[PDB]
Design an enzyme around this catalytic site. Structure first.
Site, mmCIF file in Angstrom:
data_model
loop_
_atom_site.group_PDB
_atom_site.id
_atom_site.type_symbol
_atom_site.label_atom_id
_atom_site.label_comp_id
_atom_site.label_asym_id
_atom_site.label_seq_id
_atom_site.Cartn_x
_atom_site.Cartn_y
_atom_site.Cartn_z
ATOM 1 C CB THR G 1 31.537 -10.907 -46.148
ATOM 2 O OG1 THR G 1 30.813 -9.910 -46.877
ATOM 3 C CG2 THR G 1 31.178 -10.822 -44.673
ATOM 4 C CB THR G 2 36.583 -13.267 -44.813
ATOM 5 O OG1 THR G 2 36.739 -12.779 -46.151
ATOM 6 C CG2 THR G 2 37.129 -14.683 -44.727
#
Ligand SMILES: CC(C)C[C@@H](C=O)NC(=O)[C@H](CC(C)C)NC(=O)[C@H](CC(C)C)NC(=O)OCc1ccccc1
Ligand SMILES: CC(C)C[C@@H](C=O)NC(=O)[C@H](CC(C)C)NC(=O)[C@H](CC(C)C)NC(=O)OCc1ccccc1
Lengths: 233, 200, 212, 196, 239, 232, 202, 233, 212
Positions: G1-2
């Site tokens: 996740t970014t």
């Protein structure tokens, strides 16, 4: 005769009779006076006995080291209010380690006493109070009514035949600020004396005094402890 | 600790030591381990000092209320049942409390053993505490229902003294009580050091 | 908070003749990560009280919201009574102790400085309800590194001037930056005196010798 | 552990139990009674955790007596046994389980003698004979070997003796005395204690 | 007996209990509030029932929030209870949403709280009327009034109490839409003196408060020097 | 939860709801109880057998425990509720105190229950008066009476219900150590007192007898007739 | 996740990857992690999918009712405050890191960070998620004051591309969204559109 | 109509006024306080000869040093007495001391008047207690006599009479009582007045007498002692 | 998360014929650090009663405040000040009220009884209390007690007159036991605070100990 049976019933004149009757209870009570100077706040009350062999009912109660009250009305309600005030003072000291300001204590009383006057099945508190205290803002004298209203006063009297007392306090109001503690108490006693019904004099058995000051925790004088003040009047 | 009580012809004798320890440290040597619930009822303490003191005091208040309401002194069986029910509510929550309830009721002298674990029984002789095993041996060999009053005092003192000798957590002075038909009396309080000289 | 997430490091405090001064760096560490580098950990409680905090920043923000609201309510009455630094210190001790008793602590260590009635106040409050007042305070690693310097000076000289206290704080902040692995070079200095509370901008420990 | 045993005959129920109240390697009492008089024709034998046994048995006793006082007739042994199981099972999953092992013995005018077995999980079983405690392991085989449906009460007491002698010879715990009782159409009769 | 509870309609569809509550509000001393370009100004005719009362006793102007004021008329005890409710609503808004409550929203929340007391026999209608004023740069000056029935409206100049009609007539000539708070304060003082009846009531004390740009958006009592100037101007005007 | 004050004071200091409950007790069938030297007897007049009712289910004399029994006069349903509450309390007292209840204790419990219903919110006073008799563990016979108001007293002999004034008047003149000298004489005293009000006699009165060790016993119709014959 | 959000004069730019994993399995490879709370207000979600979705739905309900009552567009600070209030109160139960970005008339483009624990802070630009740790140096080195919308979009695209390359819990496609007074303009970079950096080969 | 918590035009609660009226229906009770101790006397008022006088308990002991005399609706006083006994034992359990007479009276009086109809409790008291209590005991201040009314008002009194003959019993107490009176004189005076007011002839079976002295605990006179005193009286 | 932490401290109380001494050190610490050097454990309750609390400082402050509140409640209700015995009995109930979350505090009440003679009550964390002639509690309790038993108690000594304990001898004994304890106990030894309860009132003295 149908608008004077509940506290949630307005009358056509926009008056709540139940509150009016509660105000009439304190009138039947016994007289009490309260005045202040630049340094001290004084409460003097006239105690009366039901019978000659019965002790005179006490009228001045402790609330905290800097607050005291004089009651006039239903004693059972007075104890309920006094208990509430003591708890509020205790909670402030426990949480903030500081005396509860007198005005904030009075505001709490008004909020509590207002709730009964707006709910079905409840009744007003049938007791009037004369709160005397000392805080960072100086001496304080307050008056409370069965209707949840309070007034910051400089000299007030409540109870039976208290209008004669209020007349004296207004006449000499200009002198209270700059008088000594002994002079201030004598002023309170002289007013109470006016309330008395002619052929009767102030006595150590029916006079009780409460004093709070800048360097004087609230104290109550009763019995022979009142003699020093009475000597001179 | 070592508490001891037994029934004989002339009532019930109650004895205990006066030592309280915090771990391996002797906190006190003057603890009163016998509670005067009523002029006719006594209670002994063994286990947690706070637990025992609090619940015995609670029992004393309940017994006093019972007398006021019923205009008659509570029986030993009722008092022990009262304590058993009060402490059973907290079973498994860590209370440590071993008690003997001694008194003279309408039925006669009574002796009940109540434990925080829920036990409640009556018997002729009982011993509660860390030194109870040691006091049982002396008491068992010397006990007889037909003991004389002076002999009963000596047996109770000896049983406690021997327990204090063998048990690290028991010592101090031996407090002796005697419950009779007209109430209990504080017999004596003999120090273990003095008793050691007498018995040796 | 059972487990803190974003935490601030040590907070310093020392009282001088006529006021108190508090220092703390602007850095929220997310477990060995300089994540947020421009957050102020000092709060102006009221006209005569200021508050720095360590530990979880979210819990600090919660206390900011609650304490700020109370001050607003007291000012609404306008009766001439205002909370003193002692009163705020007492309130915080009770709030922290109560949360600890319920087993839901506010993971913070707070330093309260103030100046009322011509007297300086400096107080300490841990997450477990421990509180006291001392001439100098240093939470977190400041207790090990900065407190010895402050105590030594104060024992020699019980009463300090404003300039002496400020220089002393800067030296301690420099030491903390050298030896504290969760410290930051940008920090704030808050001062309370008869003229109120003033917070100094993002100062930097310019004096950093690195003779290796 | 305590010991309970029950033998049911054609027109009677014979029950016995030890009389020992131990507390950490010491016999605090040598004449403990583990039988509770539910009614004029029902007996409850309760063993298990300290406090739980007395609290449960007394609670059941109060209810059973209350039923008799309210309706004018006593509960049947079957109804009393099922009433006990209902209360035990209900408390099983609560915050305060009762860890008690029970033997219920009784006589009904119509149904006749009945012996019931119940463990702390509140599983109810009707058996000609049953035993509780560690001693049950040594004595149950004896009962299986020698029991018959038409056993006279004199022979039943003899068979009970053989079970108790086995405990003395082979069991490790000291159980010198045993309370003995019998229930038949005339009520509960207390027999002489079997002692060693 | 159609007027004994707030949970019964009259044959013609009227809640007499609410109407009586308004009647109580009509026996109080008048209180006025005028909105202007810069901000809002409040004024109250506080009668001195007894000379033994301290100046400032039974103050009828309140600060429900640091940017919101409040003037009241009628039963004082009920008014103080509503002020506590308004403070609670304002405080709760800030904690939940993080910024000062808009005056319109605050008036709506308090009005609904008031309205909830005219639906059941278990409680009675508040016997008091009050007005809320505030100033923000984004929203500007705002003034609202709420009656016992729970109705709230925005106003340019409002009156409540005994001499409501006379005050409304005086307020009509001010042209407040293009005036400043400094000039309005003098006008507010002038109106109160005119409507007051010296023959009936013995004496009164003038209480003034304002909120606007000059105060930086914080409701506060008018300074003593300004109040003295306004009182002198009003007295001089009453030639 | 209905919480109106059913019972309140009135001018001159009266609890009309309590007084009405008393006039409800007065409409009930007569009940008599006497305390003998070694026996306590309870009697009650039956309004009408009806020749169709099952007499087993209309008993006005009930046993609270093995050593205590009571007879009531008033609302039948209210009595059944009070009787059940006493029965559970008697068992509860046995469980805790480990001894049988005393007549004074259970009478105090019942009276307190009645008093509570006269001062509680949203509740009607119990419309019954009870005569509680029994033997204490010491063996002393006891006889108590409880009113709807919640008051109770100990009586040598008392009557409740319809025409209780006359029966009580008859008992006052006819109660003496000689009359209660023997168990049979005590029974005849109750029967004669009942006959003062009831008309038929024998077939219109029910009698219950409690002895020291023996449990409650209900006299059979043959026994009642024989006593009536001996009386005349 | 970014998840990444940047602020420019007159609006904000949001971006995120499109990977959702259960251990090492990619349950959804085209997930949309930019949830529109309101008009001109967005939130980028990271952490637990269930918690973030539930929290986003609750705030959307709260803010919508709040805006209707006030008859004015909501403030981005208010939307962040509602996220902070819930994330802080249920900090022991929620595993959710959020960044709230949007535009309002009063304050223009704003970016707020609400990491795990419930703290709130205004930031010029924010990053979060598992893959954010790999681009802390890049964003700090390559960020500039006064960037335009196009520059911010390229800056966010480059940062996300690097994180997806390194982090194993990030990947798929890059979803962007620019928010200004004019409106919301969303786009998806996939395949060769994603910024590419040559891998050194020895 | 006319809820319990209602105020009359004169400010007097209707229910409290009626409860006070109910006191006049009770039997006479007298209590005298002397430096030697406090004595309580009460007429049993046997209704019929078949009633057992031993079962009429109008004097009860709160603690070893406190005794109470009751008049009015005797069934109501049961809850008040139970509260007083419980409060006394709680105080000993907590403070390991003996509550003063005033503190016991205060706790009981607070319980009185705590009645309501709406928003009070699931089963709160619906009416005030119709009993007047005389509390007698010995505390750190010595012998103490306190009178409590249904209105929750309590006051110390040297000598007080309550019941159907309170007016006239008080009159006699006025003439006879004096400060230096001994306990023997107080008991004789109390019996003389009781014999005067009582309609029935005074004898050892139809009255109850109890005393509390600094040395001895609460003591209720037996028949033998009662016969001795009345003989001289 | 542990809701407890040990802050050290030593307390002592000695009863006399006409006096009662309560003394304690003034060091507050945590772990290996020192929080403050001016935190006495003596608390004045009334004109003739003093309490010394040591252990977890968070619980120490709460208990002292609770006791202070309860005393005022008693005075208002009973119209008279509490006695030393009444305070001891109440404190036992207060302590046991938290049996399953006890106050990690050691208490020693010293004061005059109703007869005017000195009285000392020692307490456990869970309320178990008992009257005594002298007691020591806290970190250095094991060090202080044996000498008090030997000197004040005259235990293990033969052919020694049991002269009544004088105020001067008690004061010297209190100083000596604390000086010895400061040399061996890490948690104590910053300063010694002595409270002397007599008929005239409560007097206070402070004596320095070795800082480290
Ligand atoms: C009065 C008797 C119970 C004395 C004696 C007899 O067993 N008590 C004891 O020996 C027990 C220990 C153990 C044997 C149960 N000791 C105690 O209970 C001592 C008593 C104080 C005077 C120090 N206190 C103690 O151990 O308290 C520690 C503690 C702290 C928190 C909760 C529970 C227990
Ligand atoms: C939807 C995103 C905003 C959040 C997303 C991004 O990393 N979170 C995740 O992928 C996290 C990763 C980690 C907690 C194992 N996974 C999750 O939250 C859960 C696993 C639970 C057991 C916690 N993954 C999962 O099964 O996702 C199902 C799913 C698939 C598509 C959309 C939404 C949800």
């Amino acid at each position: 005769n149908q608008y004077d049976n509940d506290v949630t019933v307005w009358s056509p004149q926009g008056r709540i009779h139940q509150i009016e009757y509660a105000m009439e209870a304190v009138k039947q009570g016994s007289a009490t006076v309260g005045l202040k100077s630049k340094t001290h706040a004084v409460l003097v009350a006239l105690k009366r006995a039901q019978s000659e062999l019965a002790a005179h009912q006490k009228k001045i109660l402790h609330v905290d080291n800097h607050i005291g009250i004089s009651i006039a009305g239903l004693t059972a309600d007075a104890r309920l209010l006094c208990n509430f005030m003591r708890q509020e003072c205790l909670d402030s000291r426990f949480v903030f380690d500081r005396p509860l300001p007198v005005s904030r204590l009075v505001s709490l009383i008004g909020s509590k006493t207002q709730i009964p006057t707006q709910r079905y099945g409840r009744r007003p508190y049938g007791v009037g109070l004369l709160i005397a205290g000392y805080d960072d803002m100086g001496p304080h004298i307050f008056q409370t009514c069965p209707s949840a209203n309070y007034f910051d006063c400089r000299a007030m009297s409540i109870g039976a035949r208290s209008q004669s007392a209020r007349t004296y306090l207004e006449r000499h109001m200009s002198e209270f600020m700059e008088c000594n503690l002994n002079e201030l108490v004598k002023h309170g006693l002289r007013a109470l004396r006016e309330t008395l019904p002619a052929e009767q004099d102030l006595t150590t058995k029916n006079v009780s005094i409460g004093i709070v000051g800048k360097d004087l925790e609230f104290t109550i004088y009763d019995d022979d402890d009142v003699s020093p003040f009475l000597e001179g009047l | 600790t070592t508490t001891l009580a037994f029934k004989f012809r002339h009532g019930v004798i109650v004895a205990a030591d006066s030592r309280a320890t915090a771990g391996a440290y002797i906190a006190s040597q003057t603890v009163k381990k016998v509670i005067e619930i009523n002029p006719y009822l006594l209670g002994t303490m063994a286990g947690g000092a706070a637990d025992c003191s609090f619940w015995e005091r609670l029992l004393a208040r309940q017994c006093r209320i019972y007398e006021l309401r019923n205009k008659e002194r509570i029986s030993v069986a009722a008092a022990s049942k009262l304590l058993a029910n009060m402490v059973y509510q907290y079973k498994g929550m860590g209370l440590s409390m071993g008690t003997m309830i001694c008194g003279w009721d309408k039925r006669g002298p009574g002796l009940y053993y109540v434990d925080s674990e829920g036990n409640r029984i009556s018997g002729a002789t009982f011993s509660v505490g860390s030194g109870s095993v040691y006091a049982y041996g002396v008491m068992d060999r010397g006990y007889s229902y037909d003991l004389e009053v002076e002999q009963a005092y000596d047996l109770a003192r000896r049983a406690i003294y021997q327990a204090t000798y063998r048990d690290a957590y028991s010592g101090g002075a031996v407090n002796l009580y005697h419950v009779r038909e007209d109430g209990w009396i504080r017999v004596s309080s003999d120090n273990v050091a003095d008793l050691h000289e007498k018995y040796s | 908070t059972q487990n803190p997430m974003v935490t601030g490091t040590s907070v310093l405090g020392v009282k001088f003749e006529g006021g108190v001064v508090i220092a703390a760096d602007m850095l929220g560490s997310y477990g060995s990560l300089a994540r947020f580098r421009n957050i102020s950990r000092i709060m102006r409680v009221n006209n005569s009280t200021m508050l720095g905090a360590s530990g979880d920043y979210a819990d600090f923000q919660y206390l900011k919201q609650v304490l700020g609201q109370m001050v607003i309510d007291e000012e609404l009455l306008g009766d001439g009574h205002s909370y003193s630094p002692r009163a705020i210190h007492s309130w915080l001790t009770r709030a922290m102790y109560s949360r600890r008793s319920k087993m839901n602590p506010l993971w913070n260590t707070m330093v309260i400085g103030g100046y009322a009635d011509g007297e300086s106040f400096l107080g300490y409050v841990d997450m477990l309800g421990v509180a006291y007042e001392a001439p100098s305070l240093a939470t977190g690693y400041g207790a090990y590194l900065a407190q010895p310097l402050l105590r030594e000076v104060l024992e020699k000289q019980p009463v300090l001037s404003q300039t002496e206290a400020r220089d002393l704080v800067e030296r301690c902040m420099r030491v903390l930056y050298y030896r504290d692995a969760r410290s930051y070079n940008r920090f704030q200095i808050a001062t309370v005196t008869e003229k109120g509370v003033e917070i100094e901008g993002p100062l930097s420990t310019e004096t950093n010798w690195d003779i290796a | 552990m305590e010991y309970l045993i029950g033998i049911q005959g054609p027109d009677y129920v014979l029950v016995a139990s030890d009389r020992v109240a131990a507390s950490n390697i010491v016999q605090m009492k040598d004449d403990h009674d583990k039988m509770f008089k539910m009614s004029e024709k029902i007996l409850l034998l309760c063993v298990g955790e300290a406090g739980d046994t007395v609290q449960f048995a007394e609670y059941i006793q109060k209810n059973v007596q209350l039923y008799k006082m309210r309706n004018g007739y006593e509960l049947s042994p079957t109804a009393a046994a099922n009433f006990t199981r209902r209360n035990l099972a209900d408390c099983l999953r609560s915050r305060t389980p009762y860890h008690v092992n029970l033997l219920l013995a009784g006589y009904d005018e119509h149904e006749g003698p009945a012996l019931y077995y119940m463990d702390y999980l509140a599983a109810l079983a009707k058996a000609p004979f049953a035993a509780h405690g560690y001693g049950a392991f040594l004595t149950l085989s004896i009962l299986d070997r020698y029991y018959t449906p038409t056993i006279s009460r004199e022979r039943a007491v003899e068979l009970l003796r053989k079970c108790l002698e086995e405990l003395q010879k082979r069991f490790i715990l000291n159980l010198p005395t045993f309370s003995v009782r019998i229930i038949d159409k005339n009520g509960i009769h207390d027999l002489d204690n079997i002692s060693f | 007996g159609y007027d004994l509870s707030a949970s019964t309609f009259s044959p013609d569809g009227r809640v007499f209990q609410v109407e009586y509550a308004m009647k109580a509000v009509e026996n109080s001393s008048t209180a006025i509030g005028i909105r202007c370009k810069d901000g809002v100004v409040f004024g109250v005719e506080k009668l001195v029932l007894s000379k033994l009362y301290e100046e400032g006793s039974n103050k009828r102007l309140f600060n429900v929030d640091r940017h919101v004021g409040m003037a009241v008329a009628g039963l004082l005890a009920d008014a103080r209870s509503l002020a506590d409710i308004a403070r609670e609503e304002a405080s709760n808004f800030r904690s939940n949403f993080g910024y000062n409550i808009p005056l319109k929203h605050l008036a709506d929340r308090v009005a609904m709280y008031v309205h909830a007391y005219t639906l059941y026999s278990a409680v009675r209608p508040f016997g008091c009327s009050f007005m809320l004023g505030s100033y923000s740069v984004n929203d500007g000056a705002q003034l609202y009034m709420i009656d016992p029935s729970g109705v709230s409206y925005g106003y340019w100049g409002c009156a409540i109490g005994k001499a409501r009609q006379a005050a409304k007539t005086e307020i009509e000539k001010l042209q407040m839409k293009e005036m400043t708070c400094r000039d309005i304060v003098k006008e507010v003082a002038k109106i109160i003196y005119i409507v007051h009846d010296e023959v009936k009531d013995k004496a009164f004390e003038l209480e003034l408060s304002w909120v606007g740009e000059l105060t930086n958006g914080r409701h506060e009592i008018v300074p003593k020097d300004i109040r003295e100037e306004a009182e002198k101007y009003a007295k001089e005007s009453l030639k | 939860s209905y919480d109106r004050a059913i019972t309140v004071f009135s001018p001159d200091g009266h609890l009309f709801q309590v007084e009405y409950a008393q006039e409800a007790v007065k409409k009930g069938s007569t009940a008599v109880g006497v305390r003998g030297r070694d026996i306590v007897v309870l009697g009650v007049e039956k309004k009408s057998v009806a020749k169709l009712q099952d007499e087993r289910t209309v008993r006005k004399i009930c046993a609270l425990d093995d050593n205590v029994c009571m007879a009531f006069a008033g609302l039948t349903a209210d009595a059944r509720i009070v009787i059940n509450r006493a029965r559970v309390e008697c068992q509860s007292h046995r469980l805790t105190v480990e001894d049988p209840v005393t007549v004074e204790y259970i009478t105090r419990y019942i009276a307190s229950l009645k008093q509570r219903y006269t001062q509680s919110n949203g509740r009607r006073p119990f419309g019954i008066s009870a005569l509680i008799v029994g033997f204490d563990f010491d063996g002393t016979p006891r006889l108590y009476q409880t009113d709807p108001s919640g008051t109770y007293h100990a009586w040598k002999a008392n009557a409740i219900g319809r025409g209780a004034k006359s029966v009580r008047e008859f008992l006052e003149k006819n109660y003496t150590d000689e009359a209660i000298e023997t168990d049979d004489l005590t029974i005849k005293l109750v029967i004669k007192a009942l006959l003062e009000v009831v008309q038929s006699g024998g077939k219109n009165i029910e009698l219950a007898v409690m002895r020291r060790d023996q449990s409650l016993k209900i006299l059979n119709p043959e026994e009642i007739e024989k006593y009536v014959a001996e009386i005349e | 996740t970014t998840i990444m959000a940047v602020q420019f004069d007159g609006g904000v730019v949001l971006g995120a990857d499109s990977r959702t994993t259960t251990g090492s399995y990619i349950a959804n490879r085209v997930t949309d992690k930019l949830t529109p709370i309101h008009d001109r207000i967005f939130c980028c979600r990271s952490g637990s999918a269930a918690d973030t979705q539930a929290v986003a739905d609750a705030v959307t309900y709260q803010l919508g009712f709040h805006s209707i009552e006030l008859n004015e567009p909501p403030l981005v600070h208010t939307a962040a405050s509602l996220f902070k209030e819930m994330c802080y109160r249920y900090r022991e139960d929620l595993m959710a890191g959020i960044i709230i970005a949007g535009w309002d008339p009063q304050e223009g483009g704003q970016v707020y960070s609400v990491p795990m624990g419930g703290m709130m802070v205004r930031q010029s630009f924010a990053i979060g998620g598992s893959g954010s740790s790999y681009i802390y140096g890049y964003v700090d080195a390559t960020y500039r004051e006064g960037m335009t919308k196009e520059e911010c979009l390229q800056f966010t695209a480059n940062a996300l591309a690097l994180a997806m390359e390194r982090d194993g819990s990030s990947g798929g496609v890059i979803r962007l969204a620019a928010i200004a007074e004019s409106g919301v303009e969303r786009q998806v970079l996939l395949g060769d559109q994603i910024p590419k950096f040559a891998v050194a080969t020895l | 109509y006319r809820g319990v918590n209602t105020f009359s035009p004169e400010g007097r609660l209707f229910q409290v006024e009626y409860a006070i009226e109910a006191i006049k229906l009770g039997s006479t009770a007298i209590g005298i306080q002397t430096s030697e101790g406090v004595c309580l006397a009460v007429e049993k008022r046997i209704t019929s000869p078949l009633m057992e006088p031993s079962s009429i308990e109008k004097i009860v002991e709160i603690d070893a040093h406190i005794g109470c005399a009751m008049s009015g609706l005797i069934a109501d006083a049961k809850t008040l007495i139970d509260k007083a006994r419980v409060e006394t034992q709680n105080h000993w359990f907590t403070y390991n001391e003996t509550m003063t007479v005033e503190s016991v009276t205060q706790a009981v009086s607070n319980l009185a008047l705590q009645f309501g109809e709406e928003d009070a409790d699931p089963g709160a008291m619906s009416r005030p207690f119709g009993v007047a209590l005389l509390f007698g005991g010995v505390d750190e201040k010595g012998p103490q006599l306190f009178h409590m009314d249904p209105s929750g008002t309590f006051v110390q009194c040297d000598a007080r009479a309550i019941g159907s003959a309170s007016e006239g019993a008080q009159s006699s107490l006025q003439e006879v009582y004096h400060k230096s009176m001994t306990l023997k004189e107080a008991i004789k005076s109390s019996l003389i007045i009781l014999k005067q007011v009582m309609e029935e002839k005074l004898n050892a079976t139809n009255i109850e007498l109890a005393t509390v002295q600094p040395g001895q605990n609460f003591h209720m006179f037996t028949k033998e002692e009662l016969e001795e005193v009345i003989k001289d009286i | 998360f542990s809701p407890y932490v040990f802050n050290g401290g030593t307390i002592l109380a000695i009863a006399g014929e006409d006096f009662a001494i309560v003394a304690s050190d003034t060091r507050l610490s945590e772990g290996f650090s020192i929080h403050t050097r001016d935190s006495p454990k003596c608390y004045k309750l009334t004109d003739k009663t003093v309490i010394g609390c040591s252990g977890f400082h968070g619980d120490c402050l709460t208990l002292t405040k609770i006791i202070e509140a309860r005393l005022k409640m008693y005075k208002h209700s009973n119209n008279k000040a509490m006695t030393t015995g009444a305070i001891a009995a109440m404190l036992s109930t207060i302590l046991y009220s938290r049996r399953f979350f006890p106050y990690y505090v050691y208490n020693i009440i010293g004061g005059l009884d109703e007869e005017g003679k000195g009285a000392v009550y020692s307490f456990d964390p869970v309320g178990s209390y008992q009257r005594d002639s002298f007691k020591a509690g806290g970190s250095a309790s094991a060090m202080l007690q044996p000498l008090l038993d030997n000197q004040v108690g005259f235990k293990n000594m033969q052919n020694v007159e049991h002269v009544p304990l004088s105020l001067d001898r008690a004061m010297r004994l209190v100083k000596d036991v604390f000086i010895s304890a400061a040399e061996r106990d890490v948690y104590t030894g910053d300063a010694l605070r002595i409270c002397i309860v007599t008929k005239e009132g409560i007097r206070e003295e402070t004596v320095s100990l070795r800082k480290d």
